[PDB]
Design a protein around this ligand. Structure first.
Ligand SMILES: N[C@@H](CCC(=O)N[C@@H](CS)C(=O)NCC(=O)O)C(=O)O
Length: 299
Protein backbone atom coordinates (compact mmCIF):
# COMPACT_ATOMS: atom_id res chain seq x y z
CA UNK A 1 0.00 0.00 0.00
CA UNK A 2 0.58 3.79 -0.16
CA UNK A 3 3.32 5.35 1.93
CA UNK A 4 3.40 9.13 1.67
CA UNK A 5 6.49 11.07 2.62
CA UNK A 6 5.40 14.42 4.03
CA UNK A 7 8.49 16.60 3.59
CA UNK A 8 7.87 20.13 4.80
CA UNK A 9 9.85 22.85 6.61
CA UNK A 10 10.43 22.63 10.37
CA UNK A 11 8.73 25.04 12.78
CA UNK A 12 11.67 27.62 12.73
CA UNK A 13 11.69 28.05 8.96
CA UNK A 14 10.04 31.26 7.86
CA UNK A 15 7.55 28.79 6.32
CA UNK A 16 7.28 26.59 9.39
CA UNK A 17 4.00 27.98 10.74
CA UNK A 18 2.34 27.39 7.35
CA UNK A 19 3.96 23.95 7.14
CA UNK A 20 2.46 22.91 10.48
CA UNK A 21 -1.06 23.87 9.27
CA UNK A 22 -0.59 22.02 6.02
CA UNK A 23 0.61 18.99 8.01
CA UNK A 24 -2.49 19.14 10.19
CA UNK A 25 -4.66 18.94 7.06
CA UNK A 26 -2.69 16.03 5.62
CA UNK A 27 -3.07 14.23 8.98
CA UNK A 28 -6.82 15.00 9.18
CA UNK A 29 -7.39 13.52 5.71
CA UNK A 30 -5.22 10.45 6.51
CA UNK A 31 -7.24 9.73 9.63
CA UNK A 32 -10.52 9.85 7.70
CA UNK A 33 -9.56 8.19 4.47
CA UNK A 34 -7.10 5.58 5.86
CA UNK A 35 -5.82 4.90 2.43
CA UNK A 36 -2.10 5.54 3.25
CA UNK A 37 0.64 5.58 5.85
CA UNK A 38 2.45 8.83 6.55
CA UNK A 39 6.24 9.18 6.88
CA UNK A 40 6.87 12.65 8.23
CA UNK A 41 10.17 14.42 8.13
CA UNK A 42 11.25 18.04 8.35
CA UNK A 43 13.36 19.30 5.46
CA UNK A 44 13.91 22.40 3.40
CA UNK A 45 16.64 23.82 1.16
CA UNK A 46 20.10 22.54 2.06
CA UNK A 47 18.88 19.09 3.30
CA UNK A 48 15.73 18.56 1.21
CA UNK A 49 17.44 16.30 -1.30
CA UNK A 50 19.09 14.17 1.38
CA UNK A 51 15.89 13.73 3.40
CA UNK A 52 13.80 13.16 0.28
CA UNK A 53 16.34 10.52 -0.68
CA UNK A 54 16.09 8.88 2.74
CA UNK A 55 12.24 8.86 2.66
CA UNK A 56 12.40 7.08 -0.74
CA UNK A 57 15.06 4.70 0.60
CA UNK A 58 12.58 3.95 3.41
CA UNK A 59 9.76 2.87 1.04
CA UNK A 60 7.86 6.11 0.44
CA UNK A 61 6.05 5.86 -2.92
CA UNK A 62 4.70 9.42 -3.21
CA UNK A 63 5.76 12.71 -1.60
CA UNK A 64 3.93 15.82 -0.44
CA UNK A 65 6.32 18.74 -0.47
CA UNK A 66 8.47 20.70 -0.63
CA UNK A 67 7.05 24.08 0.24
CA UNK A 68 9.74 26.65 -0.55
CA UNK A 69 10.51 27.71 -4.10
CA UNK A 70 14.23 27.22 -3.60
CA UNK A 71 13.77 23.67 -2.22
CA UNK A 72 11.76 22.75 -5.31
CA UNK A 73 14.61 23.80 -7.66
CA UNK A 74 17.24 21.91 -5.62
CA UNK A 75 15.11 18.76 -5.51
CA UNK A 76 13.70 18.44 -9.07
CA UNK A 77 16.66 16.49 -10.61
CA UNK A 78 16.46 13.90 -7.81
CA UNK A 79 12.68 13.37 -8.03
CA UNK A 80 12.05 9.68 -8.58
CA UNK A 81 8.60 9.09 -7.10
CA UNK A 82 5.50 11.18 -7.83
CA UNK A 83 6.08 14.37 -5.89
CA UNK A 84 3.48 16.99 -5.12
CA UNK A 85 5.23 20.26 -4.41
CA UNK A 86 3.14 22.93 -2.72
CA UNK A 87 4.52 25.85 -4.67
CA UNK A 88 5.11 26.57 -8.36
CA UNK A 89 7.94 24.77 -9.95
CA UNK A 90 9.83 27.95 -10.96
CA UNK A 91 11.28 28.43 -14.44
CA UNK A 92 14.75 27.37 -13.12
CA UNK A 93 13.46 24.04 -11.77
CA UNK A 94 14.57 21.08 -13.89
CA UNK A 95 11.90 19.45 -16.01
CA UNK A 96 10.81 16.18 -14.39
CA UNK A 97 7.60 14.36 -15.25
CA UNK A 98 7.06 12.99 -11.75
CA UNK A 99 7.13 16.49 -10.24
CA UNK A 100 3.72 18.15 -9.85
CA UNK A 101 2.42 21.26 -8.04
CA UNK A 102 -0.69 22.12 -6.02
CA UNK A 103 -0.79 25.69 -4.74
CA UNK A 104 -3.05 28.66 -4.11
CA UNK A 105 -1.65 30.79 -6.98
CA UNK A 106 -3.65 33.94 -7.16
CA UNK A 107 -3.53 34.38 -10.92
CA UNK A 108 -5.67 31.26 -11.17
CA UNK A 109 -8.45 32.92 -9.26
CA UNK A 110 -8.22 36.11 -11.35
CA UNK A 111 -8.52 34.13 -14.54
CA UNK A 112 -11.54 32.31 -13.26
CA UNK A 113 -13.19 35.47 -12.11
CA UNK A 114 -12.99 36.81 -15.65
CA UNK A 115 -14.57 33.60 -16.89
CA UNK A 116 -17.33 33.82 -14.21
CA UNK A 117 -18.14 37.31 -15.24
CA UNK A 118 -18.38 36.34 -18.86
CA UNK A 119 -20.74 33.55 -17.92
CA UNK A 120 -22.82 36.12 -16.01
CA UNK A 121 -23.11 38.25 -19.24
CA UNK A 122 -21.19 41.23 -17.92
CA UNK A 123 -20.50 43.04 -21.19
CA UNK A 124 -18.67 46.11 -19.92
CA UNK A 125 -17.12 45.53 -16.52
CA UNK A 126 -14.73 47.92 -14.85
CA UNK A 127 -11.62 46.30 -13.37
CA UNK A 128 -10.41 48.27 -10.38
CA UNK A 129 -6.85 47.59 -9.31
CA UNK A 130 -5.02 48.48 -6.07
CA UNK A 131 -1.35 49.35 -5.72
CA UNK A 132 -0.09 46.44 -3.64
CA UNK A 133 1.76 43.60 -5.36
CA UNK A 134 -1.02 40.97 -5.01
CA UNK A 135 -3.67 43.28 -6.39
CA UNK A 136 -1.48 44.19 -9.35
CA UNK A 137 -0.84 40.51 -10.12
CA UNK A 138 -4.57 39.81 -9.96
CA UNK A 139 -5.45 42.68 -12.16
CA UNK A 140 -2.97 41.69 -14.93
CA UNK A 141 -4.17 38.10 -14.84
CA UNK A 142 -7.82 39.18 -14.95
CA UNK A 143 -7.22 41.62 -17.78
CA UNK A 144 -5.26 39.08 -19.85
CA UNK A 145 -7.99 36.48 -19.48
CA UNK A 146 -10.77 38.95 -20.31
CA UNK A 147 -8.95 40.02 -23.48
CA UNK A 148 -8.41 36.36 -24.49
CA UNK A 149 -12.11 35.57 -24.07
CA UNK A 150 -13.64 38.83 -25.41
CA UNK A 151 -11.03 39.78 -28.01
CA UNK A 152 -11.09 43.38 -26.63
CA UNK A 153 -9.42 44.77 -23.45
CA UNK A 154 -11.34 45.24 -20.22
CA UNK A 155 -11.71 48.81 -18.96
CA UNK A 156 -9.18 49.07 -16.15
CA UNK A 157 -8.68 51.79 -13.54
CA UNK A 158 -6.05 52.27 -10.86
CA UNK A 159 -7.77 52.76 -7.48
CA UNK A 160 -7.24 56.27 -6.08
CA UNK A 161 -8.16 56.56 -2.37
CA UNK A 162 -7.80 60.42 -2.34
CA UNK A 163 -9.99 61.02 -5.37
CA UNK A 164 -12.62 58.39 -5.90
CA UNK A 165 -14.90 60.59 -8.06
CA UNK A 166 -13.40 59.65 -11.48
CA UNK A 167 -13.66 55.95 -10.59
CA UNK A 168 -17.27 56.33 -9.48
CA UNK A 169 -18.07 58.03 -12.79
CA UNK A 170 -16.41 55.19 -14.75
CA UNK A 171 -18.19 52.64 -12.54
CA UNK A 172 -21.52 54.28 -13.46
CA UNK A 173 -20.96 53.39 -17.12
CA UNK A 174 -20.14 49.75 -16.30
CA UNK A 175 -22.46 46.75 -15.93
CA UNK A 176 -20.25 45.24 -13.20
CA UNK A 177 -17.14 45.94 -11.17
CA UNK A 178 -14.24 43.52 -10.73
CA UNK A 179 -12.05 44.16 -7.72
CA UNK A 180 -8.36 43.42 -7.51
CA UNK A 181 -8.03 45.48 -4.38
CA UNK A 182 -7.05 45.01 -0.76
CA UNK A 183 -9.96 44.25 1.56
CA UNK A 184 -9.84 47.62 3.42
CA UNK A 185 -9.98 49.65 0.20
CA UNK A 186 -12.52 47.26 -1.31
CA UNK A 187 -14.84 47.89 1.57
CA UNK A 188 -14.46 51.65 1.17
CA UNK A 189 -15.14 51.43 -2.54
CA UNK A 190 -18.18 49.11 -2.11
CA UNK A 191 -19.69 51.70 0.25
CA UNK A 192 -19.24 54.45 -2.40
CA UNK A 193 -20.51 52.53 -5.41
CA UNK A 194 -24.11 52.61 -6.44
CA UNK A 195 -25.76 49.95 -4.22
CA UNK A 196 -27.10 47.81 -7.09
CA UNK A 197 -24.07 47.49 -9.37
CA UNK A 198 -22.77 43.91 -9.38
CA UNK A 199 -19.37 43.71 -7.68
CA UNK A 200 -17.04 40.72 -7.91
CA UNK A 201 -13.77 39.69 -6.30
CA UNK A 202 -11.49 36.75 -5.67
CA UNK A 203 -10.82 35.07 -2.33
CA UNK A 204 -8.65 38.15 -1.60
CA UNK A 205 -11.91 39.64 -0.19
CA UNK A 206 -12.85 36.73 2.03
CA UNK A 207 -10.69 37.32 5.03
CA UNK A 208 -13.03 36.15 7.75
CA UNK A 209 -14.85 37.83 10.63
CA UNK A 210 -17.47 40.58 10.28
CA UNK A 211 -17.37 42.11 6.78
CA UNK A 212 -20.69 44.02 6.57
CA UNK A 213 -19.39 46.56 4.01
CA UNK A 214 -18.67 43.78 1.47
CA UNK A 215 -22.15 42.20 1.74
CA UNK A 216 -23.47 41.19 -1.64
CA UNK A 217 -20.09 41.03 -3.37
CA UNK A 218 -19.90 37.96 -5.56
CA UNK A 219 -16.63 36.08 -5.12
CA UNK A 220 -14.91 32.76 -5.74
CA UNK A 221 -13.27 30.65 -3.10
CA UNK A 222 -12.80 27.08 -1.93
CA UNK A 223 -15.64 24.56 -1.56
CA UNK A 224 -14.19 24.20 1.92
CA UNK A 225 -15.81 27.58 2.79
CA UNK A 226 -18.60 27.93 0.22
CA UNK A 227 -20.11 24.41 -0.12
CA UNK A 228 -20.76 22.88 3.30
CA UNK A 229 -22.72 20.04 1.64
CA UNK A 230 -20.02 19.14 -0.91
CA UNK A 231 -19.38 15.40 -0.33
CA UNK A 232 -15.65 15.84 0.29
CA UNK A 233 -15.98 19.00 2.33
CA UNK A 234 -18.36 17.17 4.74
CA UNK A 235 -16.28 14.14 5.50
CA UNK A 236 -13.22 15.93 6.91
CA UNK A 237 -13.14 17.62 10.31
CA UNK A 238 -12.86 21.40 10.52
CA UNK A 239 -9.60 22.58 12.12
CA UNK A 240 -9.45 22.44 15.89
CA UNK A 241 -8.30 26.08 15.98
CA UNK A 242 -10.36 28.83 14.44
CA UNK A 243 -8.04 29.90 11.65
CA UNK A 244 -7.91 33.01 9.53
CA UNK A 245 -9.29 32.29 6.11
CA UNK A 246 -5.65 32.56 4.89
CA UNK A 247 -4.47 29.86 7.27
CA UNK A 248 -7.52 27.57 7.00
CA UNK A 249 -6.87 27.60 3.23
CA UNK A 250 -3.56 25.88 4.12
CA UNK A 251 -5.37 23.23 6.17
CA UNK A 252 -7.64 22.54 3.21
CA UNK A 253 -4.55 22.49 0.97
CA UNK A 254 -3.22 19.72 3.22
CA UNK A 255 -6.39 17.69 2.86
CA UNK A 256 -6.26 17.83 -0.96
CA UNK A 257 -2.46 17.17 -1.01
CA UNK A 258 -3.13 13.94 0.89
CA UNK A 259 -5.95 13.04 -1.53
CA UNK A 260 -3.93 13.79 -4.66
CA UNK A 261 -0.89 11.94 -3.31
CA UNK A 262 -2.98 8.82 -2.86
CA UNK A 263 -4.14 9.06 -6.49
CA UNK A 264 -0.62 9.86 -7.78
CA UNK A 265 0.71 6.73 -6.13
CA UNK A 266 -1.96 4.69 -7.86
CA UNK A 267 -1.73 6.18 -11.44
CA UNK A 268 0.66 5.90 -14.43
CA UNK A 269 0.85 9.76 -14.38
CA UNK A 270 -0.75 12.95 -13.16
CA UNK A 271 -2.46 13.41 -16.50
CA UNK A 272 -5.34 11.06 -15.63
CA UNK A 273 -5.68 12.46 -12.07
CA UNK A 274 -8.67 14.66 -11.27
CA UNK A 275 -10.16 15.46 -7.84
CA UNK A 276 -13.29 17.01 -6.31
CA UNK A 277 -10.94 18.91 -4.08
CA UNK A 278 -11.96 20.72 -0.93
CA UNK A 279 -9.78 23.50 -2.43
CA UNK A 280 -11.59 23.29 -5.79
CA UNK A 281 -12.08 20.90 -8.68
CA UNK A 282 -8.57 19.84 -9.64
CA UNK A 283 -7.02 18.75 -12.93
CA UNK A 284 -3.53 18.98 -14.37
CA UNK A 285 -2.65 22.06 -16.45
CA UNK A 286 0.39 24.12 -17.35
CA UNK A 287 3.72 23.53 -15.59
CA UNK A 288 2.34 20.14 -14.24
CA UNK A 289 0.33 22.26 -11.79
CA UNK A 290 -3.09 21.05 -10.68
CA UNK A 291 -5.33 23.93 -11.52
CA UNK A 292 -8.20 24.72 -9.19
CA UNK A 293 -11.69 25.47 -10.46
CA UNK A 294 -13.68 27.32 -7.82
CA UNK A 295 -17.37 27.78 -6.97
CA UNK A 296 -18.93 31.23 -6.59
CA UNK A 297 -20.36 32.67 -3.44
CA UNK A 298 -21.90 35.87 -2.18
CA UNK A 299 -20.34 37.66 0.80
N1 LIG B 1 5.23 33.11 -9.65
C1 LIG B 1 4.81 34.17 -8.75
C2 LIG B 1 5.57 34.07 -7.42
C3 LIG B 1 5.41 32.72 -6.72
C4 LIG B 1 3.99 32.49 -6.32
O1 LIG B 1 3.12 33.26 -6.71
N2 LIG B 1 3.79 31.40 -5.54
C5 LIG B 1 2.50 30.95 -5.00
C6 LIG B 1 2.31 29.48 -5.32
S1 LIG B 1 3.27 29.03 -6.76
C7 LIG B 1 2.45 31.21 -3.53
O2 LIG B 1 3.10 32.23 -3.28
N3 LIG B 1 1.80 30.46 -2.56
C8 LIG B 1 0.84 29.32 -2.66
C9 LIG B 1 1.09 28.13 -1.74
O3 LIG B 1 2.27 27.86 -1.41
O4 LIG B 1 0.12 27.43 -1.31
C10 LIG B 1 5.02 35.55 -9.36
O5 LIG B 1 4.51 35.83 -10.48
O6 LIG B 1 5.66 36.39 -8.70
Amino acid sequence: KVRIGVILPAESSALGEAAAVVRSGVEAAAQVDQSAELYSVDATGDNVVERYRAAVADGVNVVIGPLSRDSIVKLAPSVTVPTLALNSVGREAAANPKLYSLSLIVEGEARQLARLMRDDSRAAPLLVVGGDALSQRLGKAFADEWRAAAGKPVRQMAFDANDMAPLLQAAGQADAVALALDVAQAARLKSALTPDVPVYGTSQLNVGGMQPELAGVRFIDMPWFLMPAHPAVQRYPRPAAPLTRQTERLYALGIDAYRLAVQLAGSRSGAAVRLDGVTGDLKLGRDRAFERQLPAGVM
